[PDB]
Design an enzyme around this catalytic site. Structure first.
Site, short mmCIF file in Angstrom:
data_model
loop_
_atom_site.label_atom_id
_atom_site.label_comp_id
_atom_site.label_asym_id
_atom_site.label_seq_id
_atom_site.Cartn_x
_atom_site.Cartn_y
_atom_site.Cartn_z
N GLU A 1 5.47 35.30 31.76
CA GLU A 1 6.21 36.30 31.00
C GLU A 1 5.85 37.73 31.39
O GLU A 1 6.65 38.62 31.21
CB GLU A 1 6.01 36.07 29.48
CG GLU A 1 6.55 34.70 28.97
CD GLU A 1 8.10 34.62 29.00
OE1 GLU A 1 8.76 35.64 29.32
OE2 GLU A 1 8.65 33.56 28.70
N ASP B 1 15.00 41.29 29.14
CA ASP B 1 14.48 40.05 29.74
C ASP B 1 15.48 39.60 30.80
O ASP B 1 16.40 40.36 31.14
CB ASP B 1 14.19 38.96 28.67
CG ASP B 1 15.46 38.32 28.08
OD1 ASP B 1 16.61 38.65 28.45
OD2 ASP B 1 15.31 37.48 27.19
#
Ligand SMILES: [Cl-]
Ligand SMILES: [Cl-]
Length: 162
Positions: free
Chosen positions: A11, A20
């Protein structure tokens, strides 16, 4: 290696609101804020999540606190889910981390949709599960991350992460 170090690799860490891989406002270690295209909606979800007026920026301790909550929530989502729990209970410790990684990324409903893969994982047909897991939007949109997670399910080792 463990689930925390694994998800931290997958991540990253960003201290200011970012988009994202799907284009959604996110912060910290993959903490999704909102799917709405409004940065003001993001900032407001962020202030609510942290409990103070952030103006789109958080500290590292704050990012790690959300991360702890999100890992905990992912595990809890697996254990509460009738389709996910028996698979997770059947797995060894390393492959359990791969399951958590998937839930963290795509949510408990998304993962529960991998019906065929879950069955192969439960039966410990590792090479077959790996092939089936890859035939997915998941794999096609984020191939490098998905390959690492799939390798983890296939081998039961951390090789893809070292
Ligand atoms: Cl939250
Ligand atoms: Cl990726």
């Amino acid at each position: 290696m463990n689930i925390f170090e694994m998800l931290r690799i997958d991540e990253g860490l960003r201290l200011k609101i970012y988009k994202d891989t799907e284009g959604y406002y996110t912060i910290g270690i993959g903490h999704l804020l909102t799917k709405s295209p409004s940065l003001n909606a993001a900032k407001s979800e962020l202030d609510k999540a942290i409990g103070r007026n952030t103006n789109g920026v958080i500290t590292k301790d704050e990012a790690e606190k959300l991360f702890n909550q999100d890992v905990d929530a992912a595990v809890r989502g697996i254990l509460r889910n009738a389709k996910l729990k028996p698979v997770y209970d059947s797995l060894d410790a390393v492959r359990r981390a791969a399951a958590i990684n998937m839930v963290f990324q795509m949510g408990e409903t998304g993962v529960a949709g991998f019906t065929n893969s879950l069955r192969m994982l439960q039966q410990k047909r590792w090479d077959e599960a790996a092939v089936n897991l890859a035939k997915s939007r998941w794999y096609n949109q984020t191939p490098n991350r998905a390959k690492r997670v799939i390798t983890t399910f296939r081998t039961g080792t951390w090789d893809a992460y070292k």
